[PDB]
Structures are given as structure tokens and as C-alpha cells.
Amino acid sequence: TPSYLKDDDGRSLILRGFNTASSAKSAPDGMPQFTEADLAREYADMGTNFVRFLISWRSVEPAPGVYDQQYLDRVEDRVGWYAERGYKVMLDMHQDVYSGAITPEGNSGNGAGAIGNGAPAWATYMDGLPVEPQPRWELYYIQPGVMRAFDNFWNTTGKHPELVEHYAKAWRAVADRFADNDAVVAYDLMNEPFGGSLQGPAFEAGPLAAMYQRTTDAIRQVDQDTWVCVAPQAIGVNQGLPSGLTKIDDPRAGQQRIAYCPHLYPLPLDIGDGHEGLARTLTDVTIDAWRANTAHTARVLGDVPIILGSFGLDTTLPGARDYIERVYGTAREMGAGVSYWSSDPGPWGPYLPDGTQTLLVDTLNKPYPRAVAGTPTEWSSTSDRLQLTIEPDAAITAPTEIYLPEAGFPGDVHVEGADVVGWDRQSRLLTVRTPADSGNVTVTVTPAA
Ligand code: NA
Numbered sequence: 001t002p003s004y005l006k007d008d009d010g011r012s013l014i015l016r017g018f019n020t021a022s023s024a025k026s027a028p029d030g031m032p033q034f035t036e037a038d039l040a041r042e043y044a045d046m047g048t049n050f051v052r053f054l055i056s057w058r059s060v061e062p063a064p065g066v067y068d069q070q071y072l073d074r075v076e077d078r079v080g081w082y083a084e085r086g087y088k089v090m091l092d093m094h095q096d097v098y099s100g101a102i103t104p105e106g107n108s109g110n111g112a113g114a115i116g117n118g119a120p121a122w123a124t125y126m127d128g129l130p131v132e133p134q135p136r137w138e139l140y141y142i143q144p145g146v147m148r149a150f151d152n153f154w155n156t157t158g159k160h161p162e163l164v165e166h167y168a169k170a171w172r173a174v175a176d177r178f179a180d181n182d183a184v185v186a187y188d189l190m191n192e193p194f195g196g197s198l199q200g201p202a203f204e205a206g207p208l209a210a211m212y213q214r215t216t217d218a219i220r221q222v223d224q225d226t227w228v229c230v231a232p233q234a235i236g237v238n239q240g241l242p243s244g245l246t247k248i249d250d251p252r253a254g255q256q257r258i259a260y261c262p263h264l265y266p267l268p269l270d271i272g273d274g275h276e277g278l279a280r281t282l283t284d285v286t287i288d289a290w291r292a293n294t295a296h297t298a299r300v301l302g303d304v305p306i307i308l309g310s311f312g313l314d315t316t317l318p319g320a321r322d323y324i325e326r327v328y329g330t331a332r333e334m335g336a337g338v339s340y341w342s343s344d345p346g347p348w349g350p351y352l353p354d355g356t357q358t359l360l361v362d363t364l365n366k367p368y369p370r371a372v373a374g375t376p377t378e379w380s381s382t383s384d385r386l387q388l389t390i391e392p393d394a395a396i397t398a399p400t401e402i403y404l405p406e407a408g409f410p411g412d413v414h415v416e417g418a419d420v421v422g423w424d425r426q427s428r429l430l431t432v433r434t435p436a437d438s439g440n441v442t443v444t445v446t447p448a449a
């Protein structure tokens, strides 16, 4: 059965939010094009309680050994917006195709970029190997200069043992700033690791795991309590193949706080431009295969919690809502958190460029338990109902906290199996208390007559 991240009250967290935001990748100041008013809109429309907040190595460490505390001030400012609205934050050290420094035309400055993004220019060593224009961005991964930049980072070439050490110490700098931040729950060490010339389990169990171990150790010099979240290699594994990632040791006193944060991008959904016919058949197989592989690696890592850190699609495609609902149902059964890709404007996201909602908003805006006083064994919801079964824990005194959308709960609530402590119609938060002396408790929440 699944394991959960916990809040300071000991409640088990069911995490629902977005990646915010891809616009940070190219921004000179490292910040997403996302305001406090945008967060208020998100919360009002969907009741989210989590964010995978994109940060970047190029912003943390713009020159070797010279950390930018002003950038960290900016991150802290945004984290405060989230804190004020009761969100938990996972910071993602984000890259795609290594760096903006992989081409001159795509480099928005010092490794920032709209396509390639992440590492600072000083950490990018392509050794003069070419990077030719490609018709979709993912193809840059296999261009010679990008492959070489990764091979140098992982020190496959033997020429750059320092780069992983810089990466680990950049994470330590972030962790030193955020250790005492009560809204931060997780550090996602690297978006979509790619091995370059080294592929599969030899990469994952070799230099990838070694970087995760070094970085975990560095973070634990300054932060004992934040969950350290590790990803498999993305290529193949995103598409349903197994990971060879191996266990990371957590030097913290007591129980380990490592979590697993894989992504889900079925190939048939992409190539088929939607979720109908044989593409749907094969995407459903992918989801199920992915679930089994994800559960396996989460066991290997020490029976750890899971966060689906990224998944998404163009919501206008045939079958999109069915796909989204399938993924969220799977995450629910797995006890997984979810950060959807992404909050950015356009048909993948919740809002179009003019601020109009896509179908994503209504799809995501469902009741869910946010923080449960005990282990949630099973739950379900529809627009106007939620049911939740809880394995009791008498040590927890904080109430179970549940989001109820206005759409289905226009007035008061009726709760079977628990006492209502609070029903805040402004914040949309229901708080309930359940007995801890009668075994597993089932709570059913419906609109008042
Ligand atoms: Na900058």
C-alpha cells in the first residue's frame, strides 16, 4: 500500500496542482510569468494545494561558486504567495535539452532559454559538436552537442568531474534558504535526467544515482526534513519502460524522506494526436505498465511516496478529458500526488492566452481530500459527492481537510461518518473529525438539502 508525505500535524497529504511555469525557463530573472492574482484565480477555479515550482541551476549559480541570493529572494517571495493560500511547494531544478547555451540563437542569457534551458553557460561543454535546428524540441536531445554536454556533466568523458559537485552544492544553497520554510515539502533534484551516450540502468544506477546521493548528502548538511525527490531517466520510462534507478541513502536521523517523482508521457497519445481508437488502447496499456513500473521503483527506493511530477496534453484533442480522468484515477489509486504540465497559457493549460478556460478547469475542479488525519485507504469523488476511508491514527489531533467546489456544494454540507469542525465557504475547505477507536472510518460528504 502507498506511503504519503506528511504535514507538521502528521496528516497524510494528497497533492494536486500544476507545474508553474515553463515561462520561467527563459526569464532573465528566473521567475515565471505568473502573478499573485494568477494564483488566486487558480485556487478559486480548481482548489489546488500543490505546485511543482520551476527553478534553474543557471539562476542559482550564475558563475561557478557564486550563488545568487537575490534570485533565491525572488523564489522565496513566490513561495510566500503559495504559503498564504495553503499550498505545499516542490522546487524543481528544471532543465530541458541541458541549457539555453546549446545554441547562440536560443540562449536568452547565461543558459536561460525558451527551448533549451537549465544549466548555466559555464557548465555547458559541447566541445564544438553541432546542434542543428530540429522540427520538434525533443529531437535536440540526440544532437551531438547536446549529447556531449550531458556526457561532460555526468563525467562520462572523464573531463569534468567537478560539474556534479557544483550541482550538489547549488542544491545545498537552495536547501539552506528553504529548510525553515513551512510551505516547502519537497526538492525535485533534476527534471527528466538524460544520460547522453549512456542509457538505461547503467546510467540510472551509475552516475544518476551517484549524483542523487551526493546531492542528498549535501542537502542534509542544511535541511533534515524536506523530502528529496528523485526521478528515473525520462526517455523510455516516461513511455512505460522500467527504470533501473537504485536506492538512495538518506542520512537524516529516523525514517528516510526520499520520494519518487516520475513523469508520464505515453507515446501513442503523442504520435496519434489524441486518445481514440488503437492509440487509446495502447495509451491505456502504457498507463497500466507505467503504474506497475512506478510501484516497483518506489519499493526499490524504500517503499517511498510517489508524485506524478509531470503529465499533460493539448486538451482539444479527441478523448483528452477521458485521458486526464484516467491518469488522475490512477494517481488516486496509487496514492500519488500530481502536478499537471502546466499552468502556462494555451490549450495544454487551464487558460488560453485571453484568460478563457480550457476544458481542463472543469475536469480538475473536483472534491478531494487535501490532508487526512490517518492513511487514506480509498476515496472517490464526483461533482457533488466525496467518499473517503481512513485508517485511524489517534496521535493526530488536526482535522481531516477536504476541498469542496462551489459548483456541486452551493450551500452547506452533510457528512456521514465524521463530525464537521469547519465549513469555510470562502476557502472551500471542509474540516472534519473522525473516531480513532472504531477501526477504519468511511466519511461521505454530500450537499445539504
Ligand atoms: Na538572471
Ligand code: NA
Residues within 6 Å of the ligand: 101, 121, 122, 123, 124, 125
Ligand atoms: Na559553455
Ligand code: NA
Residues within 6 Å of the ligand: 178, 179, 180, 181, 182, 183, 184, 185, 226
Ligand atoms: Na518545509
Ligand code: NA
Residues within 6 Å of the ligand: 249, 250, 251, 252, 254, 255, 256
Ligand atoms: Na537513512
